[PDB]
Amino acid sequence: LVMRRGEIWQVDLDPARGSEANNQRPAVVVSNDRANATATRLGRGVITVVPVTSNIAKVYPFQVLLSATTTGLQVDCKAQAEQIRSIATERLLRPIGRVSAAELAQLDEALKLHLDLW
Amino acid sequence: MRRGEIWQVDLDPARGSEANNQRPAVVVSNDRANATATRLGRGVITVVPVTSNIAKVYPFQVLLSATTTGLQVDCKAQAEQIRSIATERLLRPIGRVSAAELAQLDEALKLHLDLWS
């Protein structure tokens, strides 16, 4: 339960369907820390995250590349704003790391673009 | 398939306090991504689930009146339940939200997702 924004946790997105993100994948906390803090004090709750995938072959504007050097990821991964999803905190396995502030802002912009926000 | 449309979707299987079962939801992904979803025939779009419990409508939630949308009963969209789904999960298109409701949903999404800056 110690989830805060910009943190990278390993989460279990399965079961999944279609072209959705599946399996146990790293993901970035994108919900605001008020909700996340409330999850921690409760021990139960739901938070929103953006999955990353290791397939960094092509990066789209709504996707942001995250560097394994600093992030605690084992390999460079790309966050997929189009895979955004809210998750019960059952799904949190372990805390991987934190995204850089540059990566965090860039994901903010990718989310604003993907969700038509302003 | 465009932004602000209300479709019925299948959120099952689900865990914890997630939105579950077959529910209406609002398309919040931009019409650009949705257009390429329609071109591929497979893909992901992002939607906000709706719930029947109107006892309290929280800041991150937006009230939809069944008059405006063609919904069967007055419902609230839950930005805190936002999630992307494969287009397989779109069962049928119920209706469309009003432009005012859409604006408040934009604003609720900024609040829940901390997209102020």
Partner: peptide
């Protein structure tokens, strides 16, 4: 209080 709002939004019945 917004966190009260969140706790109750999660716990209140959806289905």
């Amino acid at each position: 209080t917004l966190e009260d709002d969140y706790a109750n939004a999660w716990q209140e019945w959806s289905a």
